[PDB]
Design a protein around this ligand. Structure first.
Ligand SMILES: *[C@@H]1O[C@H](CO)[C@@H](O[C@@H]2O[C@H](CO)[C@@H](O[C@@H]3O[C@H](CO)[C@@H](O)[C@H](O[C@H]4O[C@H](CO)[C@@H](O)[C@H](O)[C@@H]4O[C@H]4O[C@H](CO)[C@@H](O)[C@H](O)[C@@H]4O[C@H]4O[C@H](CO)[C@@H](O)[C@H](O)[C@@H]4O)[C@@H]3O)[C@H](O)[C@H]2NC(C)=O)[C@H](O)[C@H]1NC(C)=O
Ligand SMILES: *[C@@H]1O[C@H](CO)[C@@H](O[C@@H]2O[C@H](CO)[C@@H](O[C@@H]3O[C@H](CO)[C@@H](O)[C@H](O[C@H]4O[C@H](CO)[C@@H](O)[C@H](O)[C@@H]4O[C@H]4O[C@H](CO)[C@@H](O)[C@H](O)[C@@H]4O[C@H]4O[C@H](CO)[C@@H](O)[C@H](O)[C@@H]4O)[C@@H]3O)[C@H](O)[C@H]2NC(C)=O)[C@H](O)[C@H]1NC(C)=O
Ligand SMILES: *[C@@H]1O[C@H](CO)[C@@H](O[C@@H]2O[C@H](CO)[C@@H](O[C@@H]3O[C@H](CO)[C@@H](O)[C@H](O[C@H]4O[C@H](CO)[C@@H](O)[C@H](O)[C@@H]4O[C@H]4O[C@H](CO)[C@@H](O)[C@H](O)[C@@H]4O[C@H]4O[C@H](CO)[C@@H](O)[C@H](O)[C@@H]4O)[C@@H]3O)[C@H](O)[C@H]2NC(C)=O)[C@H](O)[C@H]1NC(C)=O
Ligand SMILES: *[C@@H]1O[C@H](CO)[C@@H](O[C@@H]2O[C@H](CO)[C@@H](O[C@@H]3O[C@H](CO)[C@@H](O)[C@H](O[C@H]4O[C@H](CO)[C@@H](O)[C@H](O)[C@@H]4O[C@H]4O[C@H](CO)[C@@H](O)[C@H](O)[C@@H]4O[C@H]4O[C@H](CO)[C@@H](O)[C@H](O)[C@@H]4O)[C@@H]3O)[C@H](O)[C@H]2NC(C)=O)[C@H](O)[C@H]1NC(C)=O
Ligand code: G20
Ligand code: G20
Ligand code: G20
Ligand code: G20
Ligand code: NAG
Ligand code: NAG
Ligand code: NAG
Ligand code: NAG
Ligand code: NAG
Ligand code: NAG
Ligand code: NAG
Ligand code: CA
Ligand code: CA
Ligand code: CA
Ligand code: CA
Lengths: 388, 388, 388, 388
C-alpha cells in the first residue's frame, strides 16, 4: 500500500520467547534440504520468512563436499516459509550471489546480491523482483554487505557495504536506496575503525546497526543512521561486556571510541538492541569459538563504559555450536511498540566437526516478551554420526 | 469477515461417514513424511486442515529413533492439507512447542504452542500468524493444553490449560482470549477432580469440553463453558459406559460427580458429543490398551447414571491400534445445524510395536450423517515388517 | 459465477491432437509418485485437472505390493495439475473411496466417493469441499459409480450408480443433484440390460453417457439424459463395430436394443461421441485384452445397425497396454462449439506384466481438431525391467 | 489488462550482470530433477520463468538412459520458477511436444508445442492454457520452431516455423497469431538461405530474430518482422565475427546476403542484439564444439562487413560446455528502455561426456547493465564423476 515509516519505539524486553526454528540438519539427513549458511529472517507486511545463501547442493548430495568455501558461482540468496527447512522444492531464489541483504519498504521488497571474483565483484539491486541498479566494486577486494535485513523508512532503505581488506582499513559506504535507485552514498564517518556485516533495526525514525570490526575490536561498532537527513555516525559499544568472537575476557572498563584490543583479524556477525536501560546484547558464550549463545541485559551499554549485566537468558548451551546472529522485527505487526527479534545461525559440519565434508546450518529465532518467561536452550539437534 | 457465533445446534447423528484419512505411515515408508503425534483437525472458514506436533524428523530418517519422547526442542505445531500426509514439503509450521491448540474465530486463527523445560515452560499465543501474548508456567510442572482445537464465539475463544502434577490435584485454568489477548482467566470449578487434554465443540452459544482425568477417573470429566458470561462448571459423565483407557469393565451404575475408581494415573484424550438423546461417546474397544475404537449412542449419558448404549459403530477393530481422539466441526459449512465430527490418532511404532525405534501415527476422521450408513473399519494400514 | 448451461453442440471432429500426458510410471521409477488406477480428467472454469483413485502408496514403496485389488480403506479420489504425475506432494485429496465421479457446475465442484465393505458401502457427496449428502447401499452389492466426470446443466448434475450383481441384472439409478442435494432419483429405463461405469458428455441441453454392460453385451449401452425434465432413456449402440473388451469379432450387422452376444461377464469402461455423421467410437485394438487403442469415425453408429468406419486414428499401438477410457470437455473454453476430448488409462504391472507386484497407470488424453492432423502413438513409456 | 506494445528501445549495454542460474545438474544429483534440453526464459507481466523440454524422467532415474534423442512421446514443454531447478514437484507442463515457443501478449500466454513422427508432425497452439489452433506439417519433414520465446505487439505474436530438410532448402513460414488464431502466414523472404531456431526480441514496434542456417552459413541470418504491417525481410549478419558453431576462423571481411562458407550441415541456436553501435553478439568460444561462451560488442555488425569487436565479456570459459542460447526481455519491467537479456544452455552428459548415459543441462542467464561491471564465468558446476 504505502511506504512503511518507523513510528514506534521498542517494546520493553523482559525476556525472549521462541519464534521460529527449522531443524534443517535433522530433517536434511533424509530430505532434499539445501546446504546453506549466512541465514537471516525478514518480514513482508503479510508474512515473515527465513533467508540464507544456498550452496547449490543438498546436504546428502555429493556436491555437499566443499561447502565450507564462501564464494562460488553456485550460491544464491533463497527465502522459504518460516520454520520450514530450506528445501529444494519450497525455496524461492531472490538473486544470485555470495553476500546479500533484503528488506521490504512497505510497498515491495528490495534484495541485493553480490557475486564475482574477489577483484571484480558487483552488487545488483533487485526491486519488486526485477534487477534495477548495479554497483561495481570500488576497492577491488571482495565487495560485501550485511548478511541480514536492511531497514526502510518512507521509501529510503540504507544499506552498508564494505569493499577492500578484511584486516586493515577498508572502504565502507552507506547507500540510501529508494525503489531500487541510489539516492546518495556516503563514506563511513565517526570513530569506528572497521565495519563488516551490519545487523540493523529501526525505531522512532532512526536506524541502528551493530556491526563487526574484523581488524582489532572485540567490542562492536555501531552505526546510527538517519534515513530522513540521510546522514550517519559511528562509535563502539562502551560496555566491558565484549560481544565479538574470538575475544579477550571482559575487563572492568570498556572503550567508546576505539577497538578494545585482544584478538586480531577475526570476528563473527552479531547484533544488539540499544535502548537505554532496555538494552540487550547477544554474544557467543565461548570467547574462543562460535559456541553457545546468550542474551544479557546491560543497561546503557552503548554509552556506559562500566556497564555490566543485570539480567540474562541462555539461548544455546556452550556445548552446542552457534554462529552468525542478527536482528529483524515485524514492522507490520499490530501493537503500540516494535517487538525486538533476532536469529542465531547454528553451524554444523566444518571446520569444527571434521567428520563430515560439508558445512551447513539450521536456524533458531526469538522475539521479546514483556513477561519474564522461563528459559530453555535451543541447539541444532542433529547427530553428526548419522551422516557418516 | 466477521467473528463467528455459535448460533446452531448439532445435527441428528444416526451414523458416521468417512471424512478424511491420510494413510501417513503407509506412504511415509517411501516419502519424506514427518514423524508426528497428538494430531487433530481444525477448520478455517474456507478450508479444513490436519494438524499435529512434528518430531522434527522423517519416519525413515535416522533421527526417527527416539520419537516416543514427548517434549524436546525439535517439535513444532504443523498443519497440512486434509487427507494429505504431513510431508516435509507441504507442511506449514504454526508455532514451536510440545503441546498446543488452535482455532479460527471467524476473522483469523489463533494458535498456542507451549515449550520449555518441565519446570519453566511457557505458552506463546499467536494470532494472525504473529506472537501476541505469552504466559509463563504457574505451577512449574509441565504447563500443557488441549491437543485439539479450541472454539470461539463472537471473538472469545476459551482455552483450558493445566499446570502441575499428572497424578494428583493440579492447577487448571480457563483463559478467555480475544484477538490473542487475555480477557480473563478462571480457576477450574465444579466437581471434576483432574483435567487434562480437553476436547471441545460448540453449539447454541455454549461450549462443551470432554477432558481426561489422569488421576483416578475412568469416566470422563466435562467442562461446560459460557463464552458470553465467561464462566464455566464441571462434572463427570454419569453413564456406566466408561470411556477412558485403561479402565475397569462397565458397571451397571455410574457416577456424576466423582471419578469412577479402577485404574490410576493414566488415560487417553477422548471426546463425546453430549446432546440429550442425540449423545454419542467414543472409546477404545480395549479396556487395557489403546486398541480399537468405537462410537456408542448412549442417550443422556451426561446426566443418566444408568444410561447404556442404544446403537453403535465400530471405527477401528480391536486388533488395530488407536490413540488420541478429539472433536472438531466445520462451523462455516452451509446448513441448518452443525455436523459433529471427530478424529482418531492411529499410533504405530513404540511402545506396542517394539520392532521399530520410532513412534508416529496416521489419522482417520469422520463426520455425522442423519442417514444410517453401513460401517467399515479404518485401520492405519502400514505393515511394520516393511520398516525393518 | 453462475451455473453452466450446455448451450453449444460438438465441434466437427476431423482428427485428434495430443492434450495431456503425465508419463507417471517413467517418472515414478525415481520420484514419489502415487500408485493409481481408474483415472479421468475434469475441468473447472479456470483449470483442467487429472483425477484418479490412489492406492495410498508410491510405486517404489513396499506397500505397492498388492495394488491390483480394487477396494480397500487406503484409496482416495485425488486430483493434480494437468500433465504432472500424481505425486505425494502435488496431489489434492477430494474424498475417501474406491469408486467416484466429479464435475464442476459452474459455481463449484461436486465430488462423490464411495467406500465400504461389499455389502454395506455408502456414497458421500461433497460440494464445495464439504460433505453434504450421503446415500447408503440399496442392493448390498458394491454400490459403484462412473469413474469419470459427471455433467451439469443449470445446477443439475445427473450421476449414474449401479448397485448389485456384476454379472446379472442389477439395480441402476440416475440421481439428479443440485448443490450436493438430491432432487430426485430414477430407476434405469429403456432397453439397456446392464449398466456400469458411464462416460458422459453434454451438448445442446442433453447429456449422453456411453456405459458398459458387464453381463452379456459387446456393444455399448447408451443413456441419454434430459437434465431439465430430469428423465432418461437407454439403448445400445447399433453399429457392428463392437467397442467393449473382451469382445467377438465385428459382424456385418449389429443390434440396437439387445446386447450383442459373444463374451460374458467382463468388459472395460469406454466412451463414444455420438453426433450423427460426426460420430467417433473408441475401442481397444485387441478383442482379447486391454491392449492398443483407436478411434474410428462410424457415421450414425447409434442408430445405423450396419454402420462401418469411414476414418480412423490410432492412439496406442496394439503392442502397448491401455485400459479405461472416458470423455470430458472443457465446457468453459472460448469458442462456438464444445471440443470433444477423452483420456485413456495406460495400465502397467499386474495382471499382464507379472514381473512386478504392483498395478498402476499413466494417462494420455486428446481433444478433437477440425483439421486432419497426422497421427502418432502414445504408449506409457516405462520399461518394466527397471523396476525389478 | 491490455495487449503489450513494443514502445521502447534497448537500453545501452555496457556490460552484463547475472540474472538467473538454476544449478540443475549439481542439485539433480540428489533431488528429483527432470532431464531437460532446449531451455529458455520468458516473462509474464508479473513473473519471469524458466522453460525447457522435459525428457519425462529424472536425471538419476533409470529412464535417463537415452535422453540424447530429440523427439519422443515423453517430452513436454515445462516452466518453473526463475533460478529453481526443473523438479518433478514445482514444474508446470505447458504442452506436449519436442519443439516449442511461448510468449505473453500482455493479456495472457500463448504456448505452441509440436509433436509427432518425423513425417506427420503437427503444431497445437495453446492460448490461456487451452488448445485453440492446430497446424499440420506442410513439408512432411520435422515441423519445428524457435525453441525460445516469441514476441507480441498489440495482440499479434509472429512465430517462425520451418518444415522440411535440415540440410537443404526447406519451407519456412512466419505465422502471425492473435489470441491463438492465425491472422496470416507468409513464406520466408529476403536473402537468408536457411532458417532454424530463431531467437527474437522486440523494440520500437519492430521484431528482430537471429536464427540459424544449418545448411552452409557460419554467419547468422536475421529476420526483421513488422508486426503491424505483418511483413518481414531477411539477410545475414555482415560482420566477419562469425557466430555459428561449428564454424571457420574469422576472416577480415564478411557477407551480408550469402552464407559464409566453411562448415556444412550443422550449427547451434544463438542470438544477437542488433542496435547500431549498441550491438552485441553471442558465440561459443570454440569454433569446433559447443564449448565456452562470450559476448562481443561489434558496432553495426548487421550492416558493416568489416566490423570487429570493440569490447567483450566472457560468460562460460572454453573449458566448460555451453549449448543453445537465446534472447528474452522483461517487457513489463519499469524503465525508459528495454533491458536486453539472454540465456545459455549448459549441456552435460552425451555426446561429449560419454561416461554417463544421459544428456541434460542447467541454465545461466544475464541481462544488460549500463555500468561496466566486472566479469566472472558461470559454468554448470556439476562433477560428472559423482554420477558414475
Ligand atoms: C527459569 O527461567 C528463569 C528466567 O530465565 C531463570 O532465571 C534467569 O536465570 C538466568 C541464569 O542465572 C539469569 O541470568 C544470569 O543473570 C545474571 C545477572 O543476574 C547475569 O550476570 C548472568 O550472566 C553472567 O553469567 C553467565 C554464566 O552464568 C555468563 O555466561 C554471562 O556471560 C555473565 O557472566 C560473565 O560476564 C560477566 C560480566 O562481564 C562477568 O562478571 C562474569 O564473570 C562472566 O565472565 C566470564 O564469562 C564470560 C562468558 O563466557 C566471558 O566472556 C568472560 O571473559 C568471563 O570469562 C546470567 O545472564 C537471569 O537473569 C534469570 N532471569 C530471571 C528473570 O530470573 C531460572 O533459572 C529458571 N528456573 C529454573 C528452575 O531454572
Ligand atoms: C451394516 O452397517 C450397519 C450399521 O453400522 C450394521 O448395524 C450396526 O451394527 C452394529 C454392530 O452390531 C450395531 O452396534 C452395536 O449396537 C448395540 C446396541 O444395539 C450396542 O450395544 C453394541 O455395543 C456393545 O457391543 C460392542 C461389541 O459388539 C462392544 O464393543 C460395545 O462396547 C457394547 O458392549 C459393551 O458395553 C455394553 C455397555 O456397557 C455392555 O452391556 C457389553 O457387555 C459390552 O461390555 C463389554 O465390552 C466393553 C467394550 O470392550 C468393555 O469395556 C466392558 O467392560 C465389557 O467387557 C454395538 O454398538 C449398530 O447399532 C448397528 N447399527 C444399525 C443402524 O443397525 C450392520 O452389521 C452392517 N451390515 C452387515 C451385513 O454387517
Ligand atoms: C499421417 O496421418 C494421417 C492421419 O492419421 C494418416 O491417415 C490416416 O490413416 C489411418 C490409418 O490407415 C486411417 O485409419 C484407417 O481408416 C480406415 C477407413 O478409411 C479404417 O477402416 C481403419 O480401421 C480399420 O482398420 C484398423 C487396422 O488398420 C483396425 O484396427 C480398425 O479396427 C478397422 O478395421 C477393423 O474393423 C473393421 C470394421 O468392422 C473391419 O472391416 C476390419 O476387418 C477390421 O476388423 C478386424 O479388426 C478389428 C480391430 O482389431 C477387430 O475387432 C475385428 O473383429 C476384426 O478382427 C483405420 O481407422 C485414417 O482414416 C487416415 N486418416 C486420414 C485423414 O487420412 C497417414 O497414414 C499418416 N501419414 C503417414 C505417412 O503415415
Ligand atoms: C574486470 O572486468 C572487466 C570487465 O569485464 C575486465 O575487462 C574486460 O576484459 C575483457 C577481456 O579482455 C575485455 O574483452 C575483450 O575485449 C577485446 C576488445 O577490447 C576483444 O577484442 C576481446 O575478444 C577477442 O578476444 C577473445 C579472447 O581473448 C576472444 O575469445 C574473442 O573471440 C576476440 O578475439 C577473437 O576474434 C577477433 C575478431 O575476429 C580476432 O581479431 C581475434 O584473433 C580472435 O580470433 C580468434 O579467436 C576466435 C574465438 O575463439 C575464433 O573464432 C577466431 O577464428 C580466432 O581463432 C575480448 O572481448 C573487455 O572489453 C573488458 N571490458 C572492459 C569494460 O574493460 C577485466 O579483466 C576484469 N578485471 C580484472 C582484474 O581481471
Ligand atoms: C571478506 C572478509 C570479511 N568477511 C565479511 C568474511 O570473510 C565473511 O566470513 C564468514 C564467516 O563465517 O566468518 C562468512 C562470509 N561468507 C559469505 N558471506 N559468503 C564472509 N564474507 C564474505 C563476503 O565472503
Ligand atoms: C504431562 C502429564 C499428562 N499429559 C497430559 C501427558 O503426559 C501426555 O501424554 C501423552 C500420551 O500419549 O498419553 C502424550 C502427551 N505429549 C505431548 N503433548 N507432547 C503428554 N502431554 C505432555 C504435555 O507431554
Ligand atoms: C463391481 C463389478 C463391476 N465393476 C464396475 C468392477 O468390478 C470394476 O473393475 C475394474 C476393472 O478394471 O475392470 C476396476 C474397478 N475398480 C474400482 N473402481 N476400484 C471395478 N469397480 C469397482 C466398484 O470395484
Ligand atoms: C531438425 C533439424 C534441425 N534442428 C532444428 C535440429 O535437428 C535440432 O537439433 C538439436 C541440437 O541440439 O542441435 C536439438 C533440437 N531438438 C529438439 N528441439 N528436440 C533439434 N530440433 C528438432 C526439431 O529436433
Ligand atoms: C509514511 O509517511 C509518508 C509521509 O511522510 C506517508 O505518505 C505514508 O503514507 C506513510 N506510511 C504509512 C504506512 O502511513
Ligand atoms: C456475531 O455476533 C456479533 C454481535 O453479537 C456480530 O457483530 C457479528 O457480525 C456476528 N457474526 C456473524 C458472522 O454474523
Ligand atoms: C536407536 O537408539 C538406541 C539408543 O539411542 C540404539 O541402541 C539403537 O540401536 C538405535 N536403533 C537403531 C536402529 O539404530
Ligand atoms: C444458465 O441458465 C440460467 C437460466 O436458465 C441462468 O440464470 C444462468 O446465469 C445461465 N448460466 C450462465 C453461465 O449464463
Ligand atoms: C508381495 O506379496 C506377496 C504376498 O503378500 C509375497 O509373496 C511377495 O514376495 C511380495 N513381493 C515382493 C517383491 O516382496
Ligand atoms: C497497445 O496499443 C493499443 C492501441 O494501438 C491499445 O489499445 C493498448 O491499450 C496498448 N497497450 C497498452 C498496454 O497500453
Ligand atoms: C543404457 O542403454 C544402453 C542401450 O539401451 C545399455 O547398453 C547401457 O548399459 C545402459 N546404460 C546403463 C547404465 O544401464
Ligand atoms: Ca573482531
Ligand atoms: Ca483416567
Ligand atoms: Ca461386456
Ligand atoms: Ca551453420
Amino acid at each position: 500500500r504505502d511506504f512503511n515509516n518507523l513510528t514506534k519505539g521498542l517494546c520493553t524486553i523482559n525476556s525472549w520467547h521462541i519464534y521460529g526454528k527449522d531443524n534443517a540438519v535433522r530433517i536434511g539427513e533424509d530430505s532434499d534440504v539445501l546446504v546453506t549458511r549466512e541465514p537471516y529472517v525478514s518480514c513482508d507486511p503479510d508474512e515473515c520468512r527465513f533467508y540464507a545463501l544456498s550452496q547449490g547442493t543438498t546436504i546428502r548430495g555429493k556436491h555437499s563436499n566443499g561447502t565450507i568455501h564462501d564464494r562460488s558461482q553456485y550460491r544464491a540468496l533463497i527465502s522459504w516459509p518460516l520454520s520450514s527447512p530450506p528445501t529444494v522444492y519450497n525455496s524461492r531464489v531472490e538473486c544470485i550471489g555470495w553476500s546479500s541483504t533484503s528488506c521490504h519498504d512497505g510497498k515491495t521488497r528490495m534484495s541485493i546480491c553480490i557475486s564475482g571474483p574477489n577483484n571484480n565483484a558487483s552488487a545488483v539491486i533487485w526491486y519488486n523482483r526485477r534487477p534495477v541498479t548495479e554497483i561495481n566494486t570500488w576497492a577491488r577486494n571482495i565487495l560485501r554487505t550485511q548478511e541480514s535485513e536492511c531497514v526502510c523508512h518512507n521509501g529510503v532503505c540504507p544499506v552498508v557495504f564494505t569493499d577492500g581488506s578484511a584486516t586493515g582499513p577498508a572502504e565502507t559506504r552507506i547507500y540510501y536506496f529508494k525503489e531500487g535507485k541510489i539516492l546518495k552514498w556516503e563514506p563511513l564517518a565517526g570513530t569506528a575503525k572497521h565495519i563488516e556485516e551490519c545487523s540493523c533495526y529501526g525505531e522512532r525514525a532512526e536506524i541502528t546497526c551493530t556491526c563487526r570490526d574484523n581488524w582489532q575490536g572485540s567490542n562492536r561498532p555501531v552505526i546510527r543512521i538517519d534515513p530522513v537527513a540521510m546522514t550517519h555516525t559511528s562509535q563502539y559499544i562502551c560496555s566491558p561486556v565484549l560481544t565479538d568472537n574470538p575475544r579477550p575476557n571482559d575487563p572492568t572498563v570498556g572503550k567508546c571510541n576505539d577497538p578494545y584490543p585482544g584478538n586480531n583479524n577475526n570476528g563473527v556477525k552479531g547484533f544488539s538492541y540499544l535502548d537505554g536501560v532496555n538494552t540487550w546484547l547477544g554474544r557467543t558464550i565461548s570467547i574462543a569459538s562460535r559456541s553457545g549463545y546468550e542474551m544479557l541485559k546491560v543497561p546503557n551499554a552503548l554509552t556506559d563504559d562500566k556497564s555490566k549485566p543485570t539480567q540474562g537468558q541462555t539461548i544455546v548451551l556452550n556445548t552446542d555450536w552457534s554462529g552468525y546472529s542478527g536482528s529483524f522485527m515485524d514492522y507490520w505487526a499490530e501493537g503500540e511498540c516494535y517487538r525486538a527479534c533476532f536469529y542465531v545461525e547454528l553451524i554444523r559440519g566444518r571446520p569444527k566437526e571434521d567428520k563430515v565434508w560439508w558445512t551447513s546450518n539450521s536456524i533458531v529465532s526469538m522475539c521479546s516478551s514483556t513477561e519474564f518467561l522461563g528459559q530453555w536452550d535451543w541447539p541444532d539437534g542433529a547427530k553428526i554420526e548419522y551422516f557418516l
